[PDB]
Design a protein around this ligand. Sequence first.
Ligand SMILES: Nc1ncnc2c1ncn2[C@@H]1O[C@H](COP(=O)(O)OP(=O)(O)OP(=O)(O)O)[C@@H](O)[C@H]1O
Ligand SMILES: Nc1ncnc2c1ncn2[C@@H]1O[C@H](COP(=O)(O)OP(=O)(O)OP(=O)(O)O)[C@@H](O)[C@H]1O
Ligand SMILES: Nc1ncnc2c1ncn2[C@@H]1O[C@H](COP(=O)(O)OP(=O)(O)OP(=O)(O)O)[C@@H](O)[C@H]1O
Ligand SMILES: *[C@@H]1O[C@H](CO)[C@@H](O)[C@H](O)[C@H]1NC(C)=O
Ligand SMILES: *[C@@H]1O[C@H](CO)[C@@H](O)[C@H](O)[C@H]1NC(C)=O
Ligand SMILES: *[C@@H]1O[C@H](CO)[C@@H](O)[C@H](O)[C@H]1NC(C)=O
Ligand SMILES: *[C@@H]1O[C@H](CO)[C@@H](O)[C@H](O)[C@H]1NC(C)=O
Ligand SMILES: *[C@@H]1O[C@H](CO)[C@@H](O)[C@H](O)[C@H]1NC(C)=O
Ligand SMILES: *[C@@H]1O[C@H](CO)[C@@H](O)[C@H](O)[C@H]1NC(C)=O
Lengths: 319, 319, 319
Amino acid sequence: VLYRAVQLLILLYFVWYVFIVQKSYQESETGPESSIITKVKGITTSEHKVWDVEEYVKPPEGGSVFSIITRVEATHSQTQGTCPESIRVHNATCLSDADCVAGELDMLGNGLRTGRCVPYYQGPSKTCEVFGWCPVEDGASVSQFLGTMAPNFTILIKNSIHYPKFHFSKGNIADRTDGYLKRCTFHEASDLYCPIFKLGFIVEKAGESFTELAHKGGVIGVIINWDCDLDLPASECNPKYSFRRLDPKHVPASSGYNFRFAKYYKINGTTTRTLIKAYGIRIDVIVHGQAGKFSLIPTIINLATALTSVGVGSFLCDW
Amino acid sequence: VLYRAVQLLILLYFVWYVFIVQKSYQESETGPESSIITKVKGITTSEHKVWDVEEYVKPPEGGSVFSIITRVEATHSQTQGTCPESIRVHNATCLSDADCVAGELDMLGNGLRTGRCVPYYQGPSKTCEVFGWCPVEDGASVSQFLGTMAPNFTILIKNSIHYPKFHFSKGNIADRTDGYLKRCTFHEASDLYCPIFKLGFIVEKAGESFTELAHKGGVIGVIINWDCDLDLPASECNPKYSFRRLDPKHVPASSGYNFRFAKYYKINGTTTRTLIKAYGIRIDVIVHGQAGKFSLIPTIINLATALTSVGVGSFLCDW
Amino acid sequence: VLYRAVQLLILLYFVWYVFIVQKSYQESETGPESSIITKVKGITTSEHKVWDVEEYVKPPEGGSVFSIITRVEATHSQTQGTCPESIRVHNATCLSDADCVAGELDMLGNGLRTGRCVPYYQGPSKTCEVFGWCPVEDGASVSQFLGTMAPNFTILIKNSIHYPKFHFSKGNIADRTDGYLKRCTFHEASDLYCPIFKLGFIVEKAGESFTELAHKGGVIGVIINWDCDLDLPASECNPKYSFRRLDPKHVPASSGYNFRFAKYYKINGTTTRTLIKAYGIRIDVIVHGQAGKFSLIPTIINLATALTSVGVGSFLCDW
Ligand SMILES: Nc1ncnc2c1ncn2[C@@H]1O[C@H](COP(=O)(O)OP(=O)(O)OP(=O)(O)O)[C@@H](O)[C@H]1O
Ligand SMILES: Nc1ncnc2c1ncn2[C@@H]1O[C@H](COP(=O)(O)OP(=O)(O)OP(=O)(O)O)[C@@H](O)[C@H]1O
Ligand SMILES: Nc1ncnc2c1ncn2[C@@H]1O[C@H](COP(=O)(O)OP(=O)(O)OP(=O)(O)O)[C@@H](O)[C@H]1O
Ligand SMILES: *[C@@H]1O[C@H](CO)[C@@H](O)[C@H](O)[C@H]1NC(C)=O
Ligand SMILES: *[C@@H]1O[C@H](CO)[C@@H](O)[C@H](O)[C@H]1NC(C)=O
Ligand SMILES: *[C@@H]1O[C@H](CO)[C@@H](O)[C@H](O)[C@H]1NC(C)=O
Ligand SMILES: *[C@@H]1O[C@H](CO)[C@@H](O)[C@H](O)[C@H]1NC(C)=O
Ligand SMILES: *[C@@H]1O[C@H](CO)[C@@H](O)[C@H](O)[C@H]1NC(C)=O
Ligand SMILES: *[C@@H]1O[C@H](CO)[C@@H](O)[C@H](O)[C@H]1NC(C)=O
């Protein structure tokens, strides 16, 4: 009697919870192979200047990680030569030539001290003279904002995962002969397979301000989750998109994202460059995937564990 | 009697299957630390032009992901200025100046509309005038094929994995004083430790056409699997190379791989650029590794589980 | 009696080892989401030349993988044209025009053979003439060492991990209003949250020589481990930094790390370039993370397994 009832209870528990909920009856491959091919579109304008994708999207190869430049501090006509050192560099400020010694090379400085003391770019102060790429950015840079139309920029993310154990492959764009991808807007439900995202949409879904992230910069992750149950039709294994900032926002020291790159020229045989400090939004496309398909081995093993505890549950009910 | 036979059967099952097949007696580290150092070699020629690795391999730092450019659509002598808008842009075509309004900036366009209507690059049509990088690519581009000798290109992939738990490190190139790496060709068996692959070989092993992948572009994965059994000599833990396309081929919208980059110049003090749209093959080197080494803890734990079910198997044989 | 003692022993074993040591009572997420924002600082000087971060740090976007150039072999004034082929290329050396045939394009060569035989850059030898980027590097390159002050370079690594299951996020820089990050030096204990590392410090902690790694090049991994116990205060989940070389050092063929990039100019309307072969140290920032937080489900399941073997341990003590 109670032995039979205990049998029924222990069985029901095992069957239902373990198999139907923990999916103990399926072999699982956590971590697929993914390809991410990103393409940004959108043009923005500064003072008498039109910026295109080639200028703000760095790197340009169209991969999982890329930065959209929203603000630049550019120093033009830089050449090897002597110029006053940045006033922000330690021991820069000087009152006479005796206050600067020749040959010091601060790692945080902008060149090799010449031993002299020259007037600063903006008087009346004076700073130690250095040899290097001149003029220095902190005395000759001009700032441009090119993120006025960045929220209207778009980012097509092409993702294709693979499960080698299960030989399953699925992408995030459907095979449609119509011009869907040319006239579609991503939606979690209606347009899940239109992976074209507005930058403003991504920023909002991450709960951030576009003014703050366009001024200081930062990193937003585009997370794609493929939680696939391969015992069901492939129409069931769809992408899940999540947008969240990956860099700190409450920490003033670690908040922001900027980098420096230069464009090199040759004017009258002399190598000149334009140094650009770029504050922008780094977009990181993170792809997570877990797939499970029914296999007889896990089934038999976990059924054996189920019968095993059924037994002990019965013998303790006696004991 | 039958209790003894049941004991023998249950034991044999546990010992053989669990330990000898599931490797329950080994602690396993899934996912090593890998370094991938790729170097492409090969020169290809266009009309009165020889292309080298620096031109087609982008990025050039020699990492796990890189693109080999097989076809380019290059627009030369681009400068900020006014030019007819691409006829492919919406609302571009115009019949009089009244049909174009000043100040509109389409994100999918190529600049800021001037309010005028000018003759197109190829008559007799007319398109709205825009300010931006001019002339636009869709009216001044010239196409070059530089993949004629890409199948003969070679890709040296240097891989070195590490298992921190097991303090095991192995690379895919052997310590040989002879000039093996200068005269060797990869083979799955005879030359497994000559990781120099022809691009045509990679493309064929992926089951793709080099004409199709040289015209549209795409992504091929070079997957290296290190399934190491560290209870055996290190000579046993070798790489396994797999080649397969990672981007869709049956989906016209998501099929292909292209990117745009530019070369910037300064002619008479004016910043001019050459815009290049590059169709190429992206090579992705994916490294998978699983290692196991015998440990006493898993051994004792799984032996305890083995004896545990031996028991229940015996008590149910009674019951 | 002995049944009671056996009960006590089996229980103590299960409780202590399994829960208190194996953490069977916690759900665990292996592998977080991490953002790495690297910024190198430091200037180095060659013969009448000051190198800055923009010149040696490639790529410059500030990511997990980047290379610091310590030595360059630069070939200047390269243009499409005819020049002697490198003597190191097979079948290059020639004694008369009949020894070179027109049209051959060696993949390991530097251009298309013209059919002629011209004097080499350094006599008295002669080599087959080729068309391509000329002059070739092996006959016109000049070597510069720019790693004299690389050990004094610094690398700020900003890391922020996330556990989506546990909704936990922590970074490696603390929220301090003082100028700590401007005056701090990393220390495993006192300054764990000052993620600014000297390159020499990284190289030493990897057990390498800076002379050897500055001459040949190589790859050093900066591994950050976040082993977090989320049942404890967040002040307990701190980073663990490990430095180790990822590329082989005992294998002459696979030892080193170099890449080629070029700077393109236009002199008198002709596209000229400077080809640079860069030997440098590739810094790879690898982030590992494992987190566990107490959950009732694993607790009940593993407690059931504990009682299960307690039983069998008891029935075998009888049997
Ligand atoms: N960032 C984007 N926003 C909106 N639409 C895009 C974006 N990137 C690409 N597309 C469109 O979606 C399709 C996929 O782009 P893809 O690069 O594969 O083809 P394409 O037509 O060669 O690209 P392009 O638009 O540069 O010519 C193309 O039709 C393209 O116009
Ligand atoms: N893509 C490739 N195909 C064939 N052989 C290669 C390739 N890349 C490198 N090698 C050869 O294999 C060895 C490894 O190249 P590595 O870059 O480590 O040394 P290297 O001699 O300095 O390279 P390089 O050939 O540019 O001088 C070198 O001898 C090089 O000639
Ligand atoms: N490699 C480095 N070595 C030492 N200090 C650094 C390094 N990189 C950045 N810092 C300092 O630590 C802080 C973090 O740098 P971050 O780029 O976030 O801000 P920043 O002040 O805009 O950088 P920058 O120093 O280029 O102006 C800044 O105060 C910066 O001066
Ligand atoms: C440079 O800085 C140090 C430390 O503050 C200071 O002692 C020294 O006097 C400074 N240099 C000169 C020439 O004043
Ligand atoms: C995109 O542009 C429209 C105007 O065409 C504007 O209303 C909208 O706010 C823009 N998107 C932003 C800024 O999020
Ligand atoms: C621009 O496109 C819209 C939508 O097709 C159309 O209504 C409008 O008339 C077009 N512009 C002009 C000036 O025709
Ligand atoms: C490589 O070149 C040879 C001729 O030297 C040619 O026969 C072969 O087909 C090429 N490889 C390709 C195109 O796969
Ligand atoms: C080119 O190399 C091959 C192989 O060594 C050799 O047989 C041939 O004679 C060489 N070319 C000439 C013209 O000598
Ligand atoms: C950094 O510079 C100091 C001198 O200012 C020198 O003593 C030290 O050795 C350098 N770091 C190196 C080379 O590791």
